Short mmCIF file of C-alpha atoms in Angstrom, two decimals:
data_model
loop_
_atom_site.label_atom_id
_atom_site.label_comp_id
_atom_site.label_asym_id
_atom_site.label_seq_id
_atom_site.Cartn_x
_atom_site.Cartn_y
_atom_site.Cartn_z
CA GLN A 2 14.95 7.78 -5.20
CA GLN A 3 11.56 9.07 -6.52
CA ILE A 4 8.67 6.94 -5.27
CA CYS A 5 5.69 5.71 -7.41
CA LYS A 6 2.36 4.79 -5.89
CA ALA A 7 -0.61 2.61 -6.93
CA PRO A 8 -3.66 1.27 -5.02
CA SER A 9 -3.29 -2.23 -3.80
CA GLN A 10 -5.16 -4.80 -5.78
CA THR A 11 -5.07 -7.50 -3.05
CA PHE A 12 -5.54 -5.60 0.20
CA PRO A 13 -8.98 -6.40 1.72
CA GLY A 14 -11.32 -3.76 3.13
CA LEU A 15 -10.51 -0.52 4.93
CA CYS A 16 -6.79 0.36 5.55
CA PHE A 17 -5.95 1.41 9.13
CA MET A 18 -2.63 -0.33 9.77
CA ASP A 19 0.27 0.54 7.49
CA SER A 20 2.07 -2.69 8.40
CA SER A 21 -0.67 -4.89 6.95
CA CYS A 22 -0.85 -2.87 3.78
CA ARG A 23 2.89 -3.02 3.40
CA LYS A 24 2.81 -6.86 3.56
CA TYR A 25 0.17 -7.12 0.82
CA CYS A 26 2.05 -4.59 -1.33
CA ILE A 27 5.34 -6.38 -1.11
CA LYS A 28 3.55 -9.58 -2.30
CA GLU A 29 2.34 -7.39 -5.23
CA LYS A 30 6.00 -6.75 -6.10
CA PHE A 31 6.10 -3.23 -4.61
CA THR A 32 8.73 -2.32 -2.03
CA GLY A 33 6.34 -0.97 0.55
CA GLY A 34 2.97 0.47 1.19
CA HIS A 35 0.90 2.64 3.57
CA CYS A 36 -2.70 3.47 4.23
CA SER A 37 -4.13 6.77 3.04
CA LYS A 38 -5.40 8.20 6.34
CA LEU A 39 -7.85 9.99 4.05
CA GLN A 40 -9.71 7.36 2.10
CA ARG A 41 -8.44 4.43 4.07
CA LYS A 42 -7.00 2.65 0.98
CA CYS A 43 -3.85 0.61 0.89
CA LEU A 44 -1.36 2.41 -1.30
CA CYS A 45 1.56 0.38 -2.63
CA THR A 46 4.93 2.14 -3.29
CA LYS A 47 8.11 1.42 -5.27
CA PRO A 48 10.94 3.39 -6.80
CA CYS A 49 9.81 4.94 -10.05
#
């Protein structure tokens, strides 16, 4: 499965914990999410 990614619209502030991002992303109708260690954004993921 190819995975598509988009920045979270609902995650507040800086992203350090993947688990928190994942929770917000699932509520956004994605299937997961992770922090970009780079820019500290929550990135939501789902199958393309």
